[PDB]
């Protein structure tokens, strides 16, 4: 599923991501924009053989099981394919664990490089939330 | 689809029903509870041969086409089957026309008999909206 901007903001709020760990909804929408362009089915293989999955490009090295990342963990206790669903529940629940792991949203390199410090409220501007 | 209470409140808000024609979200959720028990696929045949469709039990006599209600109109310009979808957009758009037709939410007899004048805010109590 390719979400619209306000549609994704609303789904994230529905699943309790807004202001989670102190990160406003615009931060999460910005991260999703630059990680996946709002496409739930986005995947990207990393040089080390792990893969990033879904709307927030959650990585198989630590967070989900894909059966093809030797030595990796599965800290969200889910198959990585669950992160590609039209329903964002699994991605949100896992993102909550990631953002709680110590470095906040810096775990998302694209958030650090493209969202951090910017006018992230623009990402929810105009949305009925 | 059978919605949860807060899940439906959120979907209705997403589609601009909250405070539409002055009717708060709890009024709409209450109406859906007693019209369909939150089931998008609900149908009910009336004695006159028309049928009520969907989460808000919208009637084929005036609002949608089902091909089997002689003399009826289709003022929402949709097949009645569109009112049974998991996505509530068509039901919301049509409900906006119904509630604007002169009698407000009294068009929903179950709203008049079971929601009107009651503590309708209870229907959205606790919801992250
Ligand atoms: C070294 N290391 C990590 O780097 C790590 C982790 N979980 C997430 N990360 C990112 N665990 C459990 C870990 O041992
Ligand atoms: C008599 N009548 C109605 O009763 C009516 C209507 N549209 C909705 N209703 C309920 N129209 C167009 C109408 O002519
Ligand atoms: Na939407
Ligand atoms: Na939590
Ligand atoms: Na990580
Ligand atoms: Na929900
Ligand atoms: Na309108
Ligand atoms: Na009517």
Tab-separated table of C-alpha atoms and ligand atoms in Angstrom:
chain	number	residue	atom	x	y	z
A	1	UNK	CA	0.000	0.000	0.000
A	2	UNK	CA	1.216	3.520	-0.803
A	3	UNK	CA	-0.131	5.830	1.895
A	4	UNK	CA	-0.924	9.449	1.489
A	5	UNK	CA	0.825	11.830	3.848
A	6	UNK	CA	-2.158	12.663	6.086
A	7	UNK	CA	-3.493	9.112	5.787
A	8	UNK	CA	-0.228	7.790	7.237
A	9	UNK	CA	-0.126	10.434	9.966
A	10	UNK	CA	-3.593	9.333	11.020
A	11	UNK	CA	-2.687	5.631	10.992
A	12	UNK	CA	0.435	6.346	13.051
A	13	UNK	CA	-1.629	8.308	15.552
A	14	UNK	CA	-4.212	5.510	15.687
A	15	UNK	CA	-1.406	3.138	16.691
A	16	UNK	CA	0.012	5.465	19.366
A	17	UNK	CA	3.162	6.677	17.602
A	18	UNK	CA	2.435	10.385	17.983
A	19	UNK	CA	4.820	11.817	20.595
A	20	UNK	CA	6.082	8.305	21.330
A	21	UNK	CA	9.456	8.649	23.070
A	22	UNK	CA	8.921	12.392	22.608
A	23	UNK	CA	8.900	12.263	18.798
A	24	UNK	CA	6.074	14.214	17.229
A	25	UNK	CA	3.975	12.803	14.417
A	26	UNK	CA	5.780	14.908	11.815
A	27	UNK	CA	9.057	13.207	12.707
A	28	UNK	CA	7.531	9.786	12.067
A	29	UNK	CA	5.884	10.845	8.805
A	30	UNK	CA	9.139	12.453	7.645
A	31	UNK	CA	11.046	9.262	8.466
A	32	UNK	CA	8.542	7.159	6.523
A	33	UNK	CA	8.689	9.561	3.564
A	34	UNK	CA	12.429	9.211	3.175
A	35	UNK	CA	12.725	5.556	4.197
A	36	UNK	CA	9.955	4.160	1.957
A	37	UNK	CA	8.170	7.010	0.139
A	38	UNK	CA	5.115	5.826	2.144
A	39	UNK	CA	5.154	2.369	0.438
A	40	UNK	CA	4.465	-0.484	2.852
A	41	UNK	CA	6.052	-2.956	0.434
A	42	UNK	CA	9.449	-1.236	0.196
A	43	UNK	CA	12.496	-3.481	0.654
A	44	UNK	CA	16.180	-2.695	0.331
A	45	UNK	CA	19.149	-5.050	0.602
A	46	UNK	CA	22.169	-3.831	2.525
A	47	UNK	CA	25.787	-4.518	1.592
A	48	UNK	CA	26.169	-6.807	4.634
A	49	UNK	CA	23.327	-9.072	3.494
A	50	UNK	CA	20.622	-7.807	5.848
A	51	UNK	CA	17.440	-6.281	4.399
A	52	UNK	CA	15.283	-3.311	5.398
A	53	UNK	CA	11.519	-3.851	5.319
A	54	UNK	CA	8.425	-1.732	5.064
A	55	UNK	CA	7.219	1.781	5.676
A	56	UNK	CA	10.026	2.461	8.185
A	57	UNK	CA	12.687	0.216	6.597
A	58	UNK	CA	13.218	-1.928	9.673
A	59	UNK	CA	16.393	-3.983	9.417
A	60	UNK	CA	16.681	-7.787	9.706
A	61	UNK	CA	20.079	-7.593	11.484
A	62	UNK	CA	18.347	-6.946	14.818
A	63	UNK	CA	14.600	-6.566	14.552
A	64	UNK	CA	12.869	-9.209	12.418
A	65	UNK	CA	13.480	-12.688	11.053
A	66	UNK	CA	13.931	-13.237	7.314
A	67	UNK	CA	15.928	-16.472	7.498
A	68	UNK	CA	18.751	-15.060	5.390
A	69	UNK	CA	20.695	-12.710	7.716
A	70	UNK	CA	23.301	-14.947	9.381
A	71	UNK	CA	23.945	-14.134	13.024
A	72	UNK	CA	21.071	-11.703	13.205
A	73	UNK	CA	18.470	-11.337	15.918
A	74	UNK	CA	14.679	-10.952	15.800
A	75	UNK	CA	13.977	-8.547	18.688
A	76	UNK	CA	10.505	-7.603	17.456
A	77	UNK	CA	9.596	-11.331	17.358
A	78	UNK	CA	8.070	-11.123	13.875
A	79	UNK	CA	8.801	-12.340	10.369
A	80	UNK	CA	10.153	-9.467	8.313
A	81	UNK	CA	7.289	-10.055	5.862
A	82	UNK	CA	4.868	-8.826	8.569
A	83	UNK	CA	6.512	-5.422	8.117
A	84	UNK	CA	5.206	-5.217	4.518
A	85	UNK	CA	1.483	-5.424	5.340
A	86	UNK	CA	-1.052	-2.782	4.372
A	87	UNK	CA	-1.875	-2.557	8.095
A	88	UNK	CA	0.995	-0.773	9.838
A	89	UNK	CA	0.469	-2.329	13.317
A	90	UNK	CA	3.552	-4.592	13.151
A	91	UNK	CA	5.799	-1.826	11.817
A	92	UNK	CA	4.579	0.575	14.525
A	93	UNK	CA	5.024	-1.927	17.354
A	94	UNK	CA	8.535	-2.723	16.172
A	95	UNK	CA	9.421	0.950	15.635
A	96	UNK	CA	8.450	1.610	19.253
A	97	UNK	CA	11.070	-0.939	20.332
A	98	UNK	CA	13.695	0.524	17.983
A	99	UNK	CA	13.198	4.119	19.088
A	100	UNK	CA	13.451	2.977	22.731
A	101	UNK	CA	16.800	1.213	22.227
A	102	UNK	CA	18.987	4.161	23.248
A	103	UNK	CA	19.593	6.440	20.265
A	104	UNK	CA	16.057	7.606	19.629
A	105	UNK	CA	15.205	8.160	15.992
A	106	UNK	CA	18.894	8.268	15.022
A	107	UNK	CA	18.419	4.534	14.423
A	108	UNK	CA	16.854	5.685	11.133
A	109	UNK	CA	19.809	7.109	9.227
A	110	UNK	CA	17.495	8.853	6.756
A	111	UNK	CA	15.685	10.527	9.675
A	112	UNK	CA	19.008	11.797	11.012
A	113	UNK	CA	20.161	13.005	7.598
A	114	UNK	CA	16.893	14.386	6.194
A	115	UNK	CA	14.419	15.062	9.030
A	116	UNK	CA	16.323	15.817	12.241
A	117	UNK	CA	16.288	19.538	12.982
A	118	UNK	CA	14.015	20.409	10.052
A	119	UNK	CA	10.463	21.770	10.058
A	120	UNK	CA	8.938	18.319	10.510
A	121	UNK	CA	5.523	19.819	11.329
A	122	UNK	CA	5.206	20.518	7.588
A	123	UNK	CA	4.659	16.769	7.147
A	124	UNK	CA	1.353	16.901	9.040
A	125	UNK	CA	0.336	20.412	7.976
A	126	UNK	CA	-3.302	20.570	6.953
A	127	UNK	CA	-4.079	17.044	8.200
A	128	UNK	CA	-7.319	16.416	10.105
A	129	UNK	CA	-5.766	14.522	12.976
B	1	UNK	CA	-15.228	-5.758	8.295
B	2	UNK	CA	-16.337	-5.483	11.930
B	3	UNK	CA	-14.835	-2.290	13.337
B	4	UNK	CA	-13.922	-1.680	16.898
B	5	UNK	CA	-15.520	1.321	18.553
B	6	UNK	CA	-12.449	3.594	18.632
B	7	UNK	CA	-11.252	2.249	15.280
B	8	UNK	CA	-14.522	3.381	13.688
B	9	UNK	CA	-14.455	6.751	15.446
B	10	UNK	CA	-11.002	7.321	13.996
B	11	UNK	CA	-12.042	6.276	10.481
B	12	UNK	CA	-15.080	8.565	10.664
B	13	UNK	CA	-12.879	11.444	11.775
B	14	UNK	CA	-10.397	10.684	8.985
B	15	UNK	CA	-13.259	11.074	6.502
B	16	UNK	CA	-14.519	14.350	8.007
B	17	UNK	CA	-17.669	13.118	9.757
B	18	UNK	CA	-16.798	14.510	13.181
B	19	UNK	CA	-19.058	17.506	13.872
B	20	UNK	CA	-20.426	17.258	10.332
B	21	UNK	CA	-23.737	19.145	10.256
B	22	UNK	CA	-23.079	19.748	13.960
B	23	UNK	CA	-23.166	16.060	14.923
B	24	UNK	CA	-20.315	15.008	17.163
B	25	UNK	CA	-18.345	11.838	16.557
B	26	UNK	CA	-20.142	10.008	19.364
B	27	UNK	CA	-23.453	10.499	17.569
B	28	UNK	CA	-22.070	8.857	14.433
B	29	UNK	CA	-20.475	5.973	16.333
B	30	UNK	CA	-23.700	5.437	18.292
B	31	UNK	CA	-25.699	5.385	15.053
B	32	UNK	CA	-23.325	2.836	13.524
B	33	UNK	CA	-23.466	0.689	16.674
B	34	UNK	CA	-27.225	0.352	16.550
B	35	UNK	CA	-27.625	0.303	12.765
B	36	UNK	CA	-24.970	-2.340	11.992
B	37	UNK	CA	-23.132	-3.336	15.193
B	38	UNK	CA	-20.069	-1.863	13.404
B	39	UNK	CA	-20.279	-4.478	10.579
B	40	UNK	CA	-19.629	-3.002	7.139
B	41	UNK	CA	-21.369	-5.963	5.503
B	42	UNK	CA	-24.707	-5.579	7.311
B	43	UNK	CA	-27.821	-5.668	5.111
B	44	UNK	CA	-31.481	-5.620	6.056
B	45	UNK	CA	-34.525	-5.923	3.803
B	46	UNK	CA	-37.445	-3.624	4.504
B	47	UNK	CA	-41.110	-4.582	4.210
B	48	UNK	CA	-41.492	-2.305	1.160
B	49	UNK	CA	-38.766	-4.143	-0.762
B	50	UNK	CA	-35.954	-1.627	-0.295
B	51	UNK	CA	-32.759	-2.696	1.495
B	52	UNK	CA	-30.469	-0.974	3.996
B	53	UNK	CA	-26.732	-1.339	3.400
B	54	UNK	CA	-23.571	-1.093	5.419
B	55	UNK	CA	-22.222	0.447	8.578
B	56	UNK	CA	-24.934	3.147	8.589
B	57	UNK	CA	-27.716	1.084	6.963
B	58	UNK	CA	-28.241	3.440	4.046
B	59	UNK	CA	-31.494	2.726	2.236
B	60	UNK	CA	-31.912	1.933	-1.483
B	61	UNK	CA	-35.251	3.814	-1.712
B	62	UNK	CA	-33.407	7.129	-2.090
B	63	UNK	CA	-29.658	6.846	-1.752
B	64	UNK	CA	-28.082	3.988	-3.722
B	65	UNK	CA	-28.856	1.713	-6.649
B	66	UNK	CA	-29.427	-2.008	-6.096
B	67	UNK	CA	-31.535	-2.679	-9.194
B	68	UNK	CA	-34.360	-4.195	-7.164
B	69	UNK	CA	-36.155	-1.227	-5.523
B	70	UNK	CA	-38.794	-0.174	-8.070
B	71	UNK	CA	-39.309	3.570	-8.314
B	72	UNK	CA	-36.345	4.331	-6.114
B	73	UNK	CA	-33.660	6.940	-6.608
B	74	UNK	CA	-29.862	6.799	-6.308
B	75	UNK	CA	-28.996	10.224	-4.846
B	76	UNK	CA	-25.526	9.186	-3.684
B	77	UNK	CA	-24.755	7.999	-7.253
B	78	UNK	CA	-23.318	4.666	-6.101
B	79	UNK	CA	-24.188	0.988	-6.248
B	80	UNK	CA	-25.490	-0.117	-2.872
B	81	UNK	CA	-22.716	-2.736	-2.813
B	82	UNK	CA	-20.180	0.119	-2.474
B	83	UNK	CA	-21.710	0.714	0.961
B	84	UNK	CA	-20.496	-2.724	2.149
B	85	UNK	CA	-16.762	-2.130	1.616
B	86	UNK	CA	-14.160	-2.398	4.354
B	87	UNK	CA	-13.229	1.203	3.486
B	88	UNK	CA	-15.985	3.484	4.775
B	89	UNK	CA	-15.421	6.355	2.277
B	90	UNK	CA	-18.587	5.665	0.240
B	91	UNK	CA	-20.768	5.255	3.332
B	92	UNK	CA	-19.389	8.487	4.826
B	93	UNK	CA	-19.848	10.503	1.634
B	94	UNK	CA	-23.416	9.271	1.304
B	95	UNK	CA	-24.182	9.833	5.000
B	96	UNK	CA	-23.091	13.452	4.575
B	97	UNK	CA	-25.771	13.855	1.895
B	98	UNK	CA	-28.403	12.117	4.038
B	99	UNK	CA	-27.747	14.179	7.154
B	100	UNK	CA	-27.942	17.353	5.027
B	101	UNK	CA	-31.366	16.491	3.571
B	102	UNK	CA	-33.416	18.386	6.163
B	103	UNK	CA	-34.020	16.198	9.215
B	104	UNK	CA	-30.462	15.792	10.418
B	105	UNK	CA	-29.689	12.433	11.963
B	106	UNK	CA	-33.397	11.669	12.443
B	107	UNK	CA	-33.074	10.016	9.023
B	108	UNK	CA	-31.557	7.135	11.022
B	109	UNK	CA	-34.509	5.821	13.010
B	110	UNK	CA	-32.201	3.865	15.323
B	111	UNK	CA	-30.254	7.072	16.045
B	112	UNK	CA	-33.491	8.835	16.971
B	113	UNK	CA	-34.692	5.949	19.133
B	114	UNK	CA	-31.415	4.877	20.768
B	115	UNK	CA	-28.842	7.697	20.540
B	116	UNK	CA	-30.630	11.057	20.399
B	117	UNK	CA	-30.440	12.823	23.751
B	118	UNK	CA	-28.217	10.181	25.360
B	119	UNK	CA	-24.619	10.445	26.567
B	120	UNK	CA	-23.208	9.842	23.089
B	121	UNK	CA	-19.721	10.929	24.201
B	122	UNK	CA	-19.479	7.532	25.929
B	123	UNK	CA	-19.081	6.024	22.449
B	124	UNK	CA	-15.722	7.755	21.946
B	125	UNK	CA	-14.608	7.697	25.585
B	126	UNK	CA	-10.996	6.630	25.930
B	127	UNK	CA	-10.313	6.794	22.175
B	128	UNK	CA	-7.048	8.324	20.942
B	129	UNK	CA	-8.590	10.592	18.351
C	1	LIG	C1	25.569	-4.945	20.001
C	1	LIG	N1	24.120	-4.881	19.940
C	1	LIG	C2	23.523	-3.984	19.166
C	1	LIG	O1	24.170	-3.232	18.516
C	1	LIG	C3	22.147	-3.930	19.110
C	1	LIG	C4	21.416	-4.777	19.838
C	1	LIG	N2	20.124	-4.509	19.598
C	1	LIG	C5	20.056	-3.498	18.725
C	1	LIG	N3	21.307	-3.140	18.423
C	1	LIG	C6	21.302	-2.040	17.474
C	1	LIG	N4	22.026	-5.690	20.624
C	1	LIG	C7	21.246	-6.620	21.421
C	1	LIG	C8	23.378	-5.742	20.677
C	1	LIG	O2	23.915	-6.544	21.368
C	2	LIG	C1	-40.410	12.926	-1.456
C	2	LIG	N1	-38.961	12.833	-1.416
C	2	LIG	C2	-38.353	12.325	-0.353
C	2	LIG	O1	-38.990	11.939	0.571
C	2	LIG	C3	-36.979	12.237	-0.322
C	2	LIG	C4	-36.259	12.666	-1.361
C	2	LIG	N2	-34.965	12.466	-1.071
C	2	LIG	C5	-34.884	11.914	0.145
C	2	LIG	N3	-36.129	11.772	0.609
C	2	LIG	C6	-36.109	11.176	1.932
C	2	LIG	N4	-36.880	13.182	-2.444
C	2	LIG	C7	-36.113	13.653	-3.583
C	2	LIG	C8	-38.231	13.267	-2.472
C	2	LIG	O2	-38.778	13.721	-3.423
C	3	LIG	NA1	-7.531	8.683	4.363
C	4	LIG	NA1	5.615	1.043	24.675
C	5	LIG	NA1	18.983	-0.765	14.270
C	6	LIG	NA1	-7.273	0.616	15.165
C	7	LIG	NA1	-20.132	18.382	2.408
C	8	LIG	NA1	-33.834	8.385	4.005
